[PDB]
Design a protein around this nucleic acid. Structure first.
Lengths: 46, 86, 271
RNA sequence: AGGACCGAACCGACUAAUGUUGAAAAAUUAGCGGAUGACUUGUGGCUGGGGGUGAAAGGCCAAUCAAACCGGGAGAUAGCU
RNA sequence: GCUCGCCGGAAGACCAAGGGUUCCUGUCCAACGUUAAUCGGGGCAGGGUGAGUCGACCCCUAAGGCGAGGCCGAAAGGCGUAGUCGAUGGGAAACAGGUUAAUAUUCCUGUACUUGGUGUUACUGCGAAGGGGGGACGGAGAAGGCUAUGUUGGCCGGGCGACGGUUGUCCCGGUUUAAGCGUGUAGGCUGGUUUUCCAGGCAAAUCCGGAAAAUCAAGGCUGAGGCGUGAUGACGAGGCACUACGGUGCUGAAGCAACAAAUGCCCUGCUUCCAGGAAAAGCCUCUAAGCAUCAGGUAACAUCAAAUCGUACCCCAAACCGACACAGGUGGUCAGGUAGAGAAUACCAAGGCGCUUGAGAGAACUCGGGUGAAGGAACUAGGCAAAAUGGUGCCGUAACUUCGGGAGAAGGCACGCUGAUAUGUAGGUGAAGCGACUUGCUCGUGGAGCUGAAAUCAGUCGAAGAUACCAGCUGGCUGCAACUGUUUAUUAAAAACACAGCACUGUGCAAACACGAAAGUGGACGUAUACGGUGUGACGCCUGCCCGGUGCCGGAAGGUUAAUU
């Protein structure tokens, strides 16, 4: 059967990528929390 | 005109392998692990000056460094005209 | 002419179509076309603001001259064309200086006819004049509401407006609704009625024929659950309530016009 | 010509059996319905939680839905166990 | 290695997406792999991806996103103009052979093509974020002309048969060749060429549009395929050598015709229909400001430049999504033979596989099948399940009906092979020849050769001839919903929802109404034959009485009645 994850790099980057996080202040707050936690990977950008 | 210093930094290691020797013996194609930013023009001029030979064309490819070690490098297939290089 | 299709299948049994052999068969006039992308009834917030809109056939917009500003130059009618953006059909007119335009086709118009606009134009169907220069009692269409704005009233297929009185700077019109209205006498109008009056006689015949006009199915309020509509649930078919819109306003009688800015121009409301 | 007909792909899902610590957190097998249309599909986009979307079933909105998920108020409160 | 089975519109081949080195070689067998493993998509080492023409980038735009100013909104921020991004779409050019252990339109061989820069020469009006062309567009249907491709014949090479026969209407194999360049024909579209004039194309134009006049319609665009050349080249059945028997090296015949052919091409065509079918740039053309013996434009030649990134491998799957080497899911391209209407189905080709535990035995019972005497729905909640029917042609076919249907109604009959009609018919194709011409990619005439149903008559075989696979059960009486459709992803497909039609009601456009503190936007670039909301639900015949009550609409004389004063 069809499962929920149907990957697509373009959609992934447009939805959760670095430039998408930086576009709004809430997304910029997501990045600040992840920097405070010390995450090795900030975003899905690769 | 590309500067000499730039040309000195495009040539890193003469690639030695089975396919390397095969190409050199067949179409006089010297193979060289060059810099990953070295453009065709850069490699051509560098080999024609530092190795002082004649280059027909460069057929460079970027080799994806295998994980757990190798970093990403560039294999230039510097086809020479008749100038015997390495 | 209205034609009944033979019942060679259900979905054809009750189809009545209005075929017009005078309508041009080729492509429309390219310089007068633009793209018209569909909306689905969604605004710039992306939300459905008008229900039951979506799909249908792709359509190109034809720029129709509603102002009729080219005064004093005669025009001849080249052909009648089908227009998918309205119930009426349009006419391609060639002005004597060599410029073409689209107008709403009046009732009796046909290829070869001569039309003209301005103060001194003759009183014939298809001619556009200020209503100051049109005899009282005339039947006109594509009527301006403000001088120079362009025609707004009586634009549908078989519609027309009657000039019933002229009192100073205003004329009184009888609208298709039956409403009596006042407009400035400097507003323009076109003599005659809009053609294609057989439009109202067509029968779609099947559900799909409405789907490809861009109309989506209407679900009755009483068929939903109470969370979705004031006509809520019930075990079986229950109503027990006064009819209302999905947002709770009493339909079936309650008047909704509230415009004090305009009330001065309504001589009589429709009945 | 046809929301025509029969019937592969395709899209579905009426019945029976099997499976029920499954080959599978809904499938397999045998049949079954539509199959030029209110058709199906690829790729992008858009609508956000008392909100969306709904040919309307309280359906669906990432195996979650008569109010998603995550984190916070928070050690809510619990005459009950 | 030899047999055997299995897929074959796939279980073959090539990709996109996604993955990420899984790819090739050498080594190892702890763990991994539902067993062993000497093997592996496992471990370790080393290699492997070569592009002016393929793709991306790039140019251009759709939906949509963002958005200087700007307009709004306690703040955060919303919307949006100029603009700028954004493919799933439009913009330039390479083919065939050969080669690696693993890369090829990328390397090599041969033969091409495109765009741009810069010089020389010759001739010259050039010049926009501006005008006009063009790009540029739906569904359905029907030819006709072709090709891919196939079959047979001819040709060439080989063969003469483990068992009766096999020097022949015998057997096996091969009979390939491209981009480009030249020609321009089956077809499609359109009258052409001059001259004069102008209320149009935000200005002006020699371009587009319009109006007259003259004179020839005999012109031009477009266009598959064929033919020529590429190419005396390459490839080529097989032979002859070396050999590590892997495999490498050398040489190399014929390389034609007829018929049948697509869902591919002509065709973005043609005919019809209503539901009336993107945009912008590249491209062509016109001028403005401006430039003036410059600069620019056109053509020829020469020369140079075409960067950067991707290229391995899987890709209906053991490499992607499903926790698994999971009976599931997953878009595009290609598609050979014999039967067949077929991309169904059976069996095969090319290729690819036997599904990572096996060996015995031959109990009950379970699963998945085959067949059954006599009965024949007695079963059961119910024919659930099974069994049955099943093709083509012809004959024949009731009630009822909205005249279309019902209807494959029902029910019958003939089907194989052989021979003759006719050493292969009707039909299809069509060569030479023969004439013609406005003389070759021409047109008639002629019928060689090839292909080829269907029928009738006669005969013959089995129990059976639509012999397999494939492939309607039928009829009678009723409830409901008109109908095709839609739904409770994962126990409900229905009489439910939708529906065409009907009615009511609201709405005069800055519409009602909706999403929005707002700004705005949808409705709608629509405008009362238009839109919204409600109920009913094709069609036919129809829809009675009641305004008490509760809404809604109208009226307002009087009573009561807020802030305020």
């Amino acid at each position: 059967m069809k499962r929920t994850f149907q990957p697509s790099v373009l959609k992934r980057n447009r939805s959760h990528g670095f430039r998408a996080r930086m576009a709004t202040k809430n997304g910029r707050q997501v990045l600040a929390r992840r920097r405070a936690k010390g995450r090795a990977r900030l975003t899905v950008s690769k | 005109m590309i500067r000499e210093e730039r040309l000195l930094k495009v040539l890193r290691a003469p690639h030695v392998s089975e396919k390397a020797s095969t190409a050199m013996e067949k179409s006089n194609t010297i193979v060289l692990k060059v810099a990953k930013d070295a453009t065709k023009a850069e490699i051509k001029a560098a080999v024609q000056k530092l190795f002082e030979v004649e280059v027909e064309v460069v057929n460079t490819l970027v080799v994806k460094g295998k994980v757990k070690r190798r970093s990403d490098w560039k294999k230039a297939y510097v086809t020479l005209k008749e100038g015997q290089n390495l | 002419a209205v034609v009944k299709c033979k019942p060679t299948s259900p979905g054809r049994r009750h189809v009545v179509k209005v075929v017009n052999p005078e309508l041009h068969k080729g492509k429309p006039f390219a310089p007068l076309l633009e793209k018209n992308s569909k909306s689905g009834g969604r605004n710039n917030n992306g939300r459905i603001t008008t229900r039951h809109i979506g799909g249908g056939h792709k359509q190109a917009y034809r720029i129709v001259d509603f102002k009729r500003n080219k005064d004093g130059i005669p025009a001849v009618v080249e052909r009648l064309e089908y227009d998918p953006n309205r119930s009426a059909n349009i006419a391609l007119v060639l002005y004597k200086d060599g410029e073409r335009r689209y107008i709403l086709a009046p009732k009796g118009l046909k290829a070869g006819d001569q039309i003209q606009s301005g103060v001194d134009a003759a009183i014939k169907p298809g001619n556009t004049l200020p209503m100051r220069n049109i005899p009282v009692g005339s039947t006109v269409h594509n009527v301006e509401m403000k001088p120079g704005k362009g025609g707004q009233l009586a634009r549908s297929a078989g519609t027309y407006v009657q000039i019933v009185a002229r009192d100073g700077a205003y004329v009184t019109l009888r609208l298709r609704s039956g409403e009596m209205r006042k407009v400035e006498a400097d507003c323009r109008a076109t003599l005659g009625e809009v053609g294609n009056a057989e439009h109202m006689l067509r029968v779609l015949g099947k559900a799909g024929a409405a789907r490809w006009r861009g109309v989506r199915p209407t679900v009755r309020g009483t068929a939903m659950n109470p969370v979705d509509h004031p006509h809520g649930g019930g075990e079986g078919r229950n109503f027990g309530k006064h009819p209302v819109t999905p947002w709770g306003v009493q339909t079936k009688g309650k008047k909704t016009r509230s415009n004090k800015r305009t009330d001065k121009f309504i001589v009589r409301r429709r009945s």
